[PDB]
Amino acid sequence: VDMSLSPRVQSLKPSKTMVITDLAATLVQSGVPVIRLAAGEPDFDTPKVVAEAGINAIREGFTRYTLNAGITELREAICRKLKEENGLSYAPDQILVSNGAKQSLLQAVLAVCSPGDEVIIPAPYWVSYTEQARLADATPVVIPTKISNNFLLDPKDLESKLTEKSRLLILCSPSNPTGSVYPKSLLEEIARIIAKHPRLLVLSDEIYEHIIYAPATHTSFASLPDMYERTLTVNGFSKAFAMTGWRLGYLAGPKHIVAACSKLQGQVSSGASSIAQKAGVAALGLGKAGGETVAEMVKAYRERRDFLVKSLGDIKGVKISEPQGAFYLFIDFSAYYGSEAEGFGLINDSSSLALYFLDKFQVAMVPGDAFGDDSCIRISYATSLDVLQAAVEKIRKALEPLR
Amino acid sequence: SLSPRVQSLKPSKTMVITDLAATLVQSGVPVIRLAAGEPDFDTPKVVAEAGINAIREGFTRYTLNAGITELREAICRKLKEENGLSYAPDQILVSNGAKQSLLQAVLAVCSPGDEVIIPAPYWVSYTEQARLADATPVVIPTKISNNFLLDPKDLESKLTEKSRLLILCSPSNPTGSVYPKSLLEEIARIIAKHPRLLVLSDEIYEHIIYAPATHTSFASLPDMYERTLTVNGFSKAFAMTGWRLGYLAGPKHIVAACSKLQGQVSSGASSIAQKAGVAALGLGKAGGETVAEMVKAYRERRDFLVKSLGDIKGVKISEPQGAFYLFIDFSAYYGSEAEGFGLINDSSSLALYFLDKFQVAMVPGDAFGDDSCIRISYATSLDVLQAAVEKIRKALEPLRA
Ligand SMILES: *Cc1c(COP(=O)(O)O)cnc(C)c1O
Ligand SMILES: *Cc1c(COP(=O)(O)O)cnc(C)c1O
Ligand code: NA
Numbered sequence A: 001v002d003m004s005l006s007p008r009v010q011s012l013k014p015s016k017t018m019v020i021t022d023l024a025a026t027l028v029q030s031g032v033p034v035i036r037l038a039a040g041e042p043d044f045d046t047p048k049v050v051a052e053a054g055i056n057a058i059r060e061g062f063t064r065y066t067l068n069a070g071i072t073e074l075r076e077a078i079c080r081k082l083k084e085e086n087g088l089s090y091a092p093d094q095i096l097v098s099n100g101a102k103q104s105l106l107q108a109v110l111a112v113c114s115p116g117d118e119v120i121i122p123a124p125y126w127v128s129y130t131e132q133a134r135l136a137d138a139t140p141v142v143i144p145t146k147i148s149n150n151f152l153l154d155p156k157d158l159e160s161k162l163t164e165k166s167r168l169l170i171l172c173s174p175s176n177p178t179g180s181v182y183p184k185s186l187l188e189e190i191a192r193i194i195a196k197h198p199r200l201l202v203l204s205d206e207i208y209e210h211i212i213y214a215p216a217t218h219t220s221f222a223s224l225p226d227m228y229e230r231t232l233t234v235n236g237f238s239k240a241f242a243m244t245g246w247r248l249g250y251l252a253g254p255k256h257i258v259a260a261c262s263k264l265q266g267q268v269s270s271g272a273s274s275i276a277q278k279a280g281v282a283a284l285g286l287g288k289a290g291g292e293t294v295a296e297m298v299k300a301y302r303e304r305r306d307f308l309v310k311s312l313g314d315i316k317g318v319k320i321s322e323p324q325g326a327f328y329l330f331i332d333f334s335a336y337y338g339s340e341a342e343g344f345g346l347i348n349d350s351s352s353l354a355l356y357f358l359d360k361f362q363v364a365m366v367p368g369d370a371f372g373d374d375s376c377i378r379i380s381y382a383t384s385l386d387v388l389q390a391a392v393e394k395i396r397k398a399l400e401p402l403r
Numbered sequence B: 001s002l003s004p005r006v007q008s009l010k011p012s013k014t015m016v017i018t019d020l021a022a023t024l025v026q027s028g029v030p031v032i033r034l035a036a037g038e039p040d041f042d043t044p045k046v047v048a049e050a051g052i053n054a055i056r057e058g059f060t061r062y063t064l065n066a067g068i069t070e071l072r073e074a075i076c077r078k079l080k081e082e083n084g085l086s087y088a089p090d091q092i093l094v095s096n097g098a099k100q101s102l103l104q105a106v107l108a109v110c111s112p113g114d115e116v117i118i119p120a121p122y123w124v125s126y127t128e129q130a131r132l133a134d135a136t137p138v139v140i141p142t143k144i145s146n147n148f149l150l151d152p153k154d155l156e157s158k159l160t161e162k163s164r165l166l167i168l169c170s171p172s173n174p175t176g177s178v179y180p181k182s183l184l185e186e187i188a189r190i191i192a193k194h195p196r197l198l199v200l201s202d203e204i205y206e207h208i209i210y211a212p213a214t215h216t217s218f219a220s221l222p223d224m225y226e227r228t229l230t231v232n233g234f235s236k237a238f239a240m241t242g243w244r245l246g247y248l249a250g251p252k253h254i255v256a257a258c259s260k261l262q263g264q265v266s267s268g269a270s271s272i273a274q275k276a277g278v279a280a281l282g283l284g285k286a287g288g289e290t291v292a293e294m295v296k297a298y299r300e301r302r303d304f305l306v307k308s309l310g311d312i313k314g315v316k317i318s319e320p321q322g323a324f325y326l327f328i329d330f331s332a333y334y335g336s337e338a339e340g341f342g343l344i345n346d347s348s349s350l351a352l353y354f355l356d357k358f359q360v361a362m363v364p365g366d367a368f369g370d371d372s373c374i375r376i377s378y379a380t381s382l383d384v385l386q387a388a389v390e391k392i393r394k395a396l397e398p399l400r401a
């Protein structure tokens, strides 16, 4: 039997996180507990009012197929949110609800990118952006950023990398993995560059929108001059509302593009969960920015961020870019590369450093090479201050003998 | 402006009928709706309670991409106890419904230019999923006089070295036909001559089956295990369509590839739905009495419809033995003229006539690759069906003149 696979599924890169995940299990399966800082999800429960709506949907028998694009009441609520929070005007037929925002993103990429098109992706990047480009038979063009610039795209670098083939720029703000927030003035410079190239669209991943630390503010890319008709706005419920397991995300965009994504979704999964969609309606019903329910999570995230930064920031050889959003610190420990650790061996890149932290000191983190930047390691602070204080002590002890 | 691949996708043809139906209903005009592809029954109470408990207990975080271990294990047990198949948990991939399971299988194994063999009448998405893999759908018509089952000679005549996937849906949507084991064996003997040819076995209607008909998993046949992608799920048997939970079982190498694809498509399925799925499998072999009650209702409805519609002059019916659809040949009526409507000459016009003039909504067979028929769903109560048969009788009466 011929077991050959399609070239596209073969083009998918190997996991750079697998080894951490596997070693953590291995360590636990022995006698060794592990501090987990690798997860890309909130540690909080889904808000009570949201869970209530989900339970209610089940009891009321709202358990049948929905419209492919999503239930009307949810798409209407999304339009109100985009208007109230982001100043954007969309009609319900410009919204597509999917099983999480990852699906919204994939479908956008597959709908707009033709083979050979180039997809511009600033690094450090969310792992899936490059792979989704590949599934479109498109070419990722990665643009590295610098920690001293808070990992923000340099517009001059963008201009340098544009070609006739450039089709899509993917912008994540607030960012996974850096927690950086793009300021409006920089977005306006980027937008002026995009406006000069008719073929160039922008995929704006805004999933962390409400996980933001005042006075930092979120600017939707679609609100910039002349950018509405070339922007695919992606957002959802996983991060702001601790609804990762529910699987609910969405895309708002130009009708011609949204129709194409909707057609694709009709072959991929049909409508998102009827139950999850009712919960999403309730989440949006919490009012602007999720109201006090979300504000409490954000206050906790801020305490955690502030503690982590002050704690790790005073370790020799550590560089930090202060995040203004999300719940990740993308930390430069590269000064330690070249070190030899007893009972482990050479630490000379993000992967070996992360594996050293876990194998020898029981703290699981994600190496920066997973995000296209080997100079750093991603730490998630979606865990309690108690876990964070414990992790900080382990990290200190781990770096101590490396000098 | 848009990728050629998304461009290549055909839109539905079914939205017209279903939208007009909804409109009429919201207008104070009662429509008997027989167009749905989902059970009338609620999700079973024990299963619904499990999803509710999952929510209350905080099982609302991301699962393993492939699915929670508990569920993949339970799926392995089901495949053994119900289908006689042995799979390991790393040979199972849980997705957001079986439609996603199917799409990922197609994308994983088909290279550009490969052929996907799809017997008609087919479920609508199969041809579109093939296009998404840059593969060529090769449709093989079946005949109502063969119970809409593949003639092995027709399969043989269409096989090439490019033939990469054969899609076998049994019990079938839209025909209700069940592949007998002896026929599956003949097909397997033909497949064995072609090393490139894999089989995608869509077994979602497995438990919706009418004794003495039985379900044979394709992967159970001699030498077929290593070349079969077994797809099944929860939507149909357990009335869980809105929950979004399905799965693939197959050779580890292929399932691993599907899992990698899924990592870029959607990540893991709903944590809540997966907990409900565990409870559904916990109802016992074939869904226990819970599913048995549904099947009993379905059978009564099938028997009634087949007897009633079969009595009508110019109506041809096959021998449905599963699912909850009748794919009815009204083609003898094409060319007729209806007052206040005009010419009826294809399945689309006939469906529109049935709906506009007689308030019964059904799906034109053209949607499934066979314009000679109309699909009627009997996922509705017997009393409603009795009313629908009466309307259909009255709708066809003046067309015979
Ligand atoms: C979590 C995340 C998303 C959305 O995830 P879903 O759970 O699929 O909604 C999108 N972008 C980034 C960078 C994320 O981290
Ligand atoms: C309903 C159905 C499926 C599965 O649908 P999901 O709800 O996506 O699980 C698969 N094949 C056929 C023919 C169906 O009718
Ligand atoms: Na805002």
Ligand code: NA
Residues within 6 Å of the ligand: B082, B083, B215, B216
């Ligand atoms: Na069986």
